[PDB]
Symmetry: C22
Subunit: 88 residues, 22 copies
Amino acid sequence: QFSEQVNYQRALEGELARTIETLGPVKSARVHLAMPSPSASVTVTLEPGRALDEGQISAVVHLVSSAVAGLPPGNVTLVDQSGHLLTQ
Amino acid sequence: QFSEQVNYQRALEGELARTIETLGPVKSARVHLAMPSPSASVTVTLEPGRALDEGQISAVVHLVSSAVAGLPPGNVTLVDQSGHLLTQ
Amino acid sequence: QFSEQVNYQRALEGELARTIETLGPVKSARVHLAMPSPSASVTVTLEPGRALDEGQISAVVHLVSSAVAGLPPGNVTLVDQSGHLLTQ
Amino acid sequence: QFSEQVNYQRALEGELARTIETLGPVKSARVHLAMPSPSASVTVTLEPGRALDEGQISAVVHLVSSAVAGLPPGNVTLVDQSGHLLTQ
Amino acid sequence: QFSEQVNYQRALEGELARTIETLGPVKSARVHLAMPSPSASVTVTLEPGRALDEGQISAVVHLVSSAVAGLPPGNVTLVDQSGHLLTQ
Amino acid sequence: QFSEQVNYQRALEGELARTIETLGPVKSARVHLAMPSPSASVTVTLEPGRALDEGQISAVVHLVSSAVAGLPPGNVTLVDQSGHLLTQ
Amino acid sequence: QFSEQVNYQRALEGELARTIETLGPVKSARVHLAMPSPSASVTVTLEPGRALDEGQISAVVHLVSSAVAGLPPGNVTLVDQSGHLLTQ
Amino acid sequence: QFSEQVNYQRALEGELARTIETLGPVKSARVHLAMPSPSASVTVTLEPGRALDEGQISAVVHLVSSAVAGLPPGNVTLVDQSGHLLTQ
Amino acid sequence: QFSEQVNYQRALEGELARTIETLGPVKSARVHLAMPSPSASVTVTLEPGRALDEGQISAVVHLVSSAVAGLPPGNVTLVDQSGHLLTQ
Amino acid sequence: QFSEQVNYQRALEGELARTIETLGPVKSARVHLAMPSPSASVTVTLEPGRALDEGQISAVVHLVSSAVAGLPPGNVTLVDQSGHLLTQ
Amino acid sequence: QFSEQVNYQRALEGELARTIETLGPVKSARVHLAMPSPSASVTVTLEPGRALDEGQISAVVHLVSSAVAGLPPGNVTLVDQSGHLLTQ
Amino acid sequence: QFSEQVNYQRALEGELARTIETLGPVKSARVHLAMPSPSASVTVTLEPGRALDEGQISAVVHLVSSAVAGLPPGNVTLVDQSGHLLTQ
Amino acid sequence: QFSEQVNYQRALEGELARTIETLGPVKSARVHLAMPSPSASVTVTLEPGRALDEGQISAVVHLVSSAVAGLPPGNVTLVDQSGHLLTQ
Amino acid sequence: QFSEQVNYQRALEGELARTIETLGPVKSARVHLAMPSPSASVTVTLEPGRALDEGQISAVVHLVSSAVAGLPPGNVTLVDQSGHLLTQ
Amino acid sequence: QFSEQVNYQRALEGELARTIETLGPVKSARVHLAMPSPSASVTVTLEPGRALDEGQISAVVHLVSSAVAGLPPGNVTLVDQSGHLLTQ
Amino acid sequence: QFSEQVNYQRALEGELARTIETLGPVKSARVHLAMPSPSASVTVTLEPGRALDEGQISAVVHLVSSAVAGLPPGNVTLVDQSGHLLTQ
Amino acid sequence: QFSEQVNYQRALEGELARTIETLGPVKSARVHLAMPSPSASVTVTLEPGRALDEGQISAVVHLVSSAVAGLPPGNVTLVDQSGHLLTQ
Amino acid sequence: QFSEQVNYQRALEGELARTIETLGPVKSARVHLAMPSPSASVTVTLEPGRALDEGQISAVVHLVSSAVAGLPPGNVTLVDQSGHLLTQ
Amino acid sequence: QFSEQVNYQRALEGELARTIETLGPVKSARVHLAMPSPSASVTVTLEPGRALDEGQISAVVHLVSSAVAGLPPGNVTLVDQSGHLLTQ
Amino acid sequence: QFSEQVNYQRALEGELARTIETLGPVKSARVHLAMPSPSASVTVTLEPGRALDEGQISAVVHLVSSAVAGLPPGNVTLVDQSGHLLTQ
Amino acid sequence: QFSEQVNYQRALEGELARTIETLGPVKSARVHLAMPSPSASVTVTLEPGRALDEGQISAVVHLVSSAVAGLPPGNVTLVDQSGHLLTQ
Amino acid sequence: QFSEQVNYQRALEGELARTIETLGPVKSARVHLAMPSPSASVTVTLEPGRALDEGQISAVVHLVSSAVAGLPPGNVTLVDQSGHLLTQ
């Protein structure tokens, strides 16, 4: 029963990261969820020579904040392939 | 029993995204639901050289807000293939 | 028991969309129901060079509002193949 | 037990629509019931070059309002093959 | 047990419609019952060049109102093969 | 148990109609019972060139009113092969 | 248990009608019982050129009123082969 | 258990009628009992050219009134082969 | 258990009637009992040219009144082969 | 258990009647008992040309009154082969 | 259990009558008991040309009154082969 | 259990009578017991030409009164082979 | 269990009588016990030409009174082979 | 269980009598016990030409009074082979 | 269980008597116990020409009084082979 | 369980008597115990020409009084092979 | 059940450390969680000739603080391959 | 369970006596215990020409008083091979 | 269940010590945990010619304090390969 | 269970005595324990020509007092191979 | 279950002693734990020609005090291979 | 279960004595524990020509006092191979 709600979360993370990949500047994403006040931590790896704008961050924040039950956008953490915590 | 209401949600998402594809400017959509106050996150990928108008957003918002039980249009999140969070 | 009331809803949607197809200007419809205050979202694809009039919308609204138990016509959402949310 | 009262409703709809076909101006009908305050939605397809008169609508309304338990004639919805919601 | 009181009603309807056929002006009848305040809806198809008189309607109304338990004659609905709701 | 009191009623109707046939002016009868305040509806088909007199109606009314438990003669309905409701 | 008290009543009716046949003017009788305040309905078919007198009716009434438990002579109904309800 | 007290009554009737046959003027009797205030109905068929006297009726009445438990002589009904109810 | 006290009564009747036969003027008797206030009904058939005297009746009455439990001599009914109820 | 106290009474009657036979004037007796206030009914058949005296009756009365439990001599009934109730 | 206390009484009677036989004037006795206030009834058959004296009666009375539990000598009944009740 | 205390009493009687035989004047005795206030009844058969004296009676009385539990000498009955009740 | 305390008493009697035999004047004894206030009855058969003295009686009385539980010497009964009750 | 305390008493009696034999003047003893206030009855058979003295009686009394539980010397009964009750 | 405490007592008696034999003047002893206030009865058989002194009695008394539980020396009974009760 | 505490006591007695044998003047001892206030009875058989002194008695008394649970030295009984109770 | 929530934590640690590896300056990470107020301890091994800036630490802190349920960023511990605790 | 604490005591006695043997002047000991206030009784057999001193007695007393649970030295009894109770 | 939370702790210790090895100056670590207020004891073995600085101790303290649930840094004990407790 | 705490005590005694042997002056010890206020009794056998000093006794006392649970040194008893109780 | 928490403690002791060996001056350690207020006792065997300093003792004390749950450093006991208790 | 906590104590004793052997002056130790206020008794056997100093005793005392749960150093007993209790 526990490996039921875990084999599922591992699929959500793999599905959520398949869309953020199909998003333009992102080359490959990697998201982990923390569903117990949940949280997430995207780890996008932007394409060579690119950088997400100030409104392109909320694109990837709300793309995950909304696809996960009860996850406000204040808990999503976005990080590049060069450190650089993009959220606040 | 849990994989009952999850194997179903995975089909809704795949059915909802099959209609948004058959919608003109959209080339391929990708929707995730967050049914626990539910939410959704469409990730349309518009056709080459196209952009959804201001009233073409509510088309795709209500197309999902209504096909999901108890989902107001204030929870649907629409995002292009170039970031650009279209909803508010 | 759950896949009982879901294998049925998937048939209603496929039956409701078979009639809206046999309706003249419509070439192919695609309806999803949201039976928990229910809702529906038709996605008609009008024939080449056609547009539903102001009274031809209530035709397709009541065609679905009445074929579904407890669904007022204020919850049915009609959308073309070019965005254009036709309902309100 | 549920597929008992559903395999039956699917037969009523197919029987009710077999009589409306044998009615003159109608070439082929298509009725769905909404038995939970029930409702119905006939979708007659009139013969080439024909139109139901003002008293020929109540013929098809009462033909269905009476063949279904507890269905007033104010819930039956009649629609042609050209939109044109005939009821009110 | 439910298909007991339904396989029976389907036989009553087929028996009631076999007598209305053997009634002179009628060529073929088609009756549905609505036993839950019950109702019925005969759909006689008169012989070529014929029309039921004002007292020939109560013949077919009471022929069904009486053959069904608890069905007043104010609930029976008679309709020709040309629309024309004959009852009131 | 239900098909017990129904396989029986179908035999009563077939027995009651076998006597009304052996009654002179009648060529073939057809009676349905409505045993729940019961009722009946005979559908005699008089011989070619014949008509039941005013006292020949009560013959066929009481012939059925008495052969059925608790059925007053005010509930029996007699109808010819030419409409013509004979009872009141 | 029900087909016990019905297979018996069908034998009483066939026995009661075998005696009324062996009664002179009667050529063949046909009696149905209505045992729930019971009733009966004899349908004698007098011999060619004969008619039961005023005291020959009570012969056939009491012949049945007494052979059936709790059946007063005011409930027995006698009818010829020419209509003609003989009782009152 | 019911066919116990019925297979017996059918034997009493056949035994009671075998004695009334061995009684002189009677050629063949036929008695039915109505044991629930019981009753009986003898149907003697007198020999050719004979008639039971006024005291020869009580012979056949008490012959049956006494051979049946709780049956007063005021409930026995005697009838010839020519109608003619002999009792009162 | 019922056919126990009935197979016995049928033997008493056959034994009681075997003694009344061995009684002189009687050629063959035939007695039925009515054991529930019991009763009996002897049906002696006197020898050719004989008649039971006034004190020869009480012989056959007490011969049966005493051989049956609780049967007073006021309930025994004696009848010849020529009607003629001998008791009172 | 009932055929226990009946197979026994049938033996008592056959034993009691075997002694009354071995009694002189009697050629063959035939006694029935009525054990529920019991009673008996002897049916002696005296030898050719003989008659029991006034004190020879109490011989056969007490011979049976005493051989049966609880049977006073006022209940024993003695009868010849020529009627003639000998007791009182 | 009943045929236990009856197969025994039948042996007592046969034993008691074997002693009264071995008693001189008696040639063969025959005793029946009435054990429920019991009673007995001896039926001695004296030797040819003999008669029991007044004190030879109490011999046979007490011979039985004492061999049976609770049987006073006032209940024993002695009878010859010529009637003649010897006791009182 | 009953044939236990009866197969025993039949042995006591046969043992008690074997001693009274070995007593001189007695040639063969025959005793029955009446054990429920018990009693006995000896039936000695004295040797040819002998008679028990007045004190030879108490020999045979106490010989039985004492060999049986609770049997006073006032209940023992002694009788010869010539009647002659010897006790009182 | 009863044949336990009876097969034993029959052995006591046979043992007690084997000692009284080995006592001189006695040739053969025969004792019965009456154990329920018990009693005994010896039946000594003295040797040819012998007689027990007045103190030789108490020898045989106490020889039995003491060998039996609860048997006073006032209940033992001694009798010769010539009657002659020796005790009191 | 009863034949347990009886097979034992029969051994005590046979053991007690084996010692009294080995006692000088006694040639063979024979003792019975009466264990329920118990008692005993020795039956010594003195050697030819011998007699137990006044103090040789208490030898055989106490030899048995003490070898049996609860048996006072006032209950032991000693008797020779010539009657002669030696105890008191 | 009873033959447990009896097979043991029979061994004690045989063991106690084996020691009294090995005691000098005694040639063979024979002791019985009376264990329920117990008692014993030794039956020593002194050697030819010997007699136990006044203090040689208490030797054999205490030899048994002490080897048996709860047996005072006032209950032991010593007897020679010539009567002569040695104890008091 | 009883033969448990008896097979043991028989071993104690045989062990206690094996030590008293290995004691000098004693040639063979023989002890019985009376364990229920217990007691013992030694029966030493001194060597030819020997006698236990006044303090050699307490040697054999305490040798047994102490080897047995709860046995005071006032209950041990010592006896030679020549009577002579040594204890007091 | 315990190895369920441990086999999972070991996978989280291996997944969390696979992303921190794909982060630029980090060559290989190694994270342990302390889920009972949880904690974590990353052990990044920076690429040859590199050092995480002051805002590149919060990148790796929030990358783990958010991917673990209920883990504040004040509990995450970051350490290089040269000691140097980077967090506070 | 009893032969458990007895097979053990028999081993203690055999072990305690094996040490007292290995004690110098003693050649062979023999101890019995009386464990229920316990006691013991050593029976040492001193070597030829030896005698235990006054302090050599307490050696063997405490050697046993201490090796047995709850045994004071006032209960141990020491005896030589020549009587001579050494303890007090 | 206990070897569940012990086979796990043995893995934590082996995992925690695998990271401290990959830390630069450390050549091989060895950590034991004391999870019941838990504790740990690292036993680092620094590389040849090296010594952990004052801030390089907190690196290894927090590396373990945080990877273990509920372990403050005041309980971690760090020790070199040359004694030298580094913590406080 | 008892032979559990006895097979163990027998091993303690054999182990405790194996150390006292390896103690110098002692050649072979032999200890018994009295564990119920326990006690012990060592039986050392000193080497030829040796004697334990006053402080060499407490060596062997405390060597046993401490190796046994709850055994004070005031209960240990030490004895040589020449009597000589060494403890107090 | 007990050998569970003992097979584990034996492994802790063997693991704790494997680290103290890898500590420089120590050549081989040997630790025992006393987990019930626990305790430990290390028994280090320093390398040839070495001695632990005053701060090198707390290294080995805290190395064990911390690796064992609930063991203060005041309970650890350190001892060399030359006695010399190093702790206090 | 008992041989569980005994097979363990026997291993502790064998392990504790293996360390005291590896201690320098000691050649072979031998310790017994008394775990119920526990105690121990070491029996060291010093090397040829050696003696434990005053502070070398507490080495071996605390080496055992600490390796055993709840054993104060005031209960440990140390003894050489020459008596000489070293503790107090």
